[PDB]
UniProtKB/Swiss-Prot annotation, chain A:
It comes from Escherichia coli (strain K12). There are no coordination bonds that occur between IspD and magnesium in any of the complexes examined to date. PANTHER family: 2-C-METHYL-D-ERYTHRITOL 4-PHOSPHATE CYTIDYLYLTRANSFERASE, CHLOROPLASTIC. One of its GO terms (molecular function) is 2-C-methyl-D-erythritol 4-phosphate cytidylyltransferase activity. Homodimer. Optimum pH is 8.3. The record marks R142, K198 as: Positions MEP for the nucleophilic attack. GO terms for biological process: isopentenyl diphosphate biosynthetic process, methylerythritol 4-phosphate pathway. PROSITE patterns: ISPD. This is 2-C-methyl-D-erythritol 4-phosphate cytidylyltransferase. Belongs to the IspD/TarI cytidylyltransferase family. IspD subfamily. Its cofactor is Mg(2+); Mn(2+); Co(2+). The record marks K12 as: Transition state stabilizer.
Swiss-Prot record, chain B:
The record marks R124, K180 as: Positions MEP for the nucleophilic attack. This is 2-C-methyl-D-erythritol 4-phosphate cytidylyltransferase. One of its GO terms (cellular component) is cytosol. It comes from Escherichia coli (strain K12). GO terms for molecular function: 2-C-methyl-D-erythritol 4-phosphate cytidylyltransferase activity; identical protein binding; magnesium ion binding.
């Protein structure tokens, strides 16, 4: 049941919450589960900041050069995934990952042949804008609509082949699930907490910090 | 450009903070709460209905001579004054109005019917979280809300009533920390980090 994690970190991840970078909170969230034996971080050539983090001397961390696109970084991480049968792909900028959700995602390997992702149901109103304009086209129906979160958990070889194939066919890949979907698979949706935010807007840092503080508080 | 706001409240400190965030802007002279806060000279109370749309219409009958109306969620007390200002600016140029909104950050999936499995990816480009306030010309909001409701439209926010009748409100990019605070125990904390 060894698992290897891959973090596509090639470029917010170096912003800090408390006295750890967001990348470090994300990485340590992964290491909470004992089955996660290694974390491969894909970093961009020339990125010198990584080497300065204490995480850079962690015996369970592997560092490799990623590419310009997500799928390329992930493929680069997978070459260093050793003999792990299952791989976890997790966003560098998702520091609020909860151990309970990780644990429940990792159960997919006992029974799943495809794997699956953490996800959050859409529960508030969403709009689709007119193309080219900041005006509303229509309101989206939330029934069966999910936010794709990370981690995304898949058999190693299958992920590998689907991503290689999607890229080789010019497929339009965003997340890892999209590569499986393109090769005809239907990954499972594992409901996770909606506060597993990707820090992408400047105000998201304070939001992430609010969510971690509230959670620490609640646990008691 | 005097503005009347409507808050459908059909947890008292959360409503209170949301209300005073609206009242903070000079153009916002009054708030109508559709249902001690009620003893504020700037706060009006009316009967809210069973649906949000009906409470908002009920607020409209209390809005006086207001030419433009702000509709705000009672559970969004982390509204920032710069976002409110950029929204109110629509009255200078818009015939339709618009809403506060934030771009969606994640890849999006549509689940297979009947299963917790992905059918397909939904393109997140051009997809927005609809926030509040929602800001519209008085008569237009009134007329679209009334008509959509009588026609059995599925109304979510106010913009959706305009949508039903064929209008396309503007998307005004706001802060993504303008979150829903629904547990009272979270308010001080949300306010300390996001206010």
């Amino acid at each position: 049941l060894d698992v290897c994690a891959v973090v596509p970190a090639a470029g917010k991840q170096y912003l800090s919450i408390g006295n750890q970078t967001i990348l470090e909170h994300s990485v340590h969230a992964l290491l909470a589960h004992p089955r996660v034996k290694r974390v491969v971080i894909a970093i961009s050539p020339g990125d010198s900041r990584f080497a300065q983090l204490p995480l850079a001397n962690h015996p369970q961390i592997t560092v490799v050069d990623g590419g310009d696109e997500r799928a390329d970084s992930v493929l680069a991480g997978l070459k260093a995934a050793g003999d792990a049968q299952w791989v976890l792909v997790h966003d560098a900028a998702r520091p609020c990952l909860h151990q309970d959700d990780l644990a429940r995602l990792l159960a997919l390997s006992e029974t799943s042949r495809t794997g699956g992702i953490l996800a959050a149901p859409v529960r508030d109103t969403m709009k689709r804008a007119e193309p080219g304009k900041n005006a509303i086209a229509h309101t989206v129906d939330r029934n069966g609509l999910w936010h794709a979160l990370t981690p995304q958990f898949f058999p190693r070889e299958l992920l590998h082949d689907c991503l290689t194939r999607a890229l080789n066919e010019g497929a339009t890949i965003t997340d890892e699930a999209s590569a499986l979907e393109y090769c005809g698979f239907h990954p499972q949706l594992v409901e996770g907490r909606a506060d597993n935010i990707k820090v992408t807007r400047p105000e998201d840092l304070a939001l992430a910090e609010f969510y971690l503080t509230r959670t620490i508080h609640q646990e008691n």
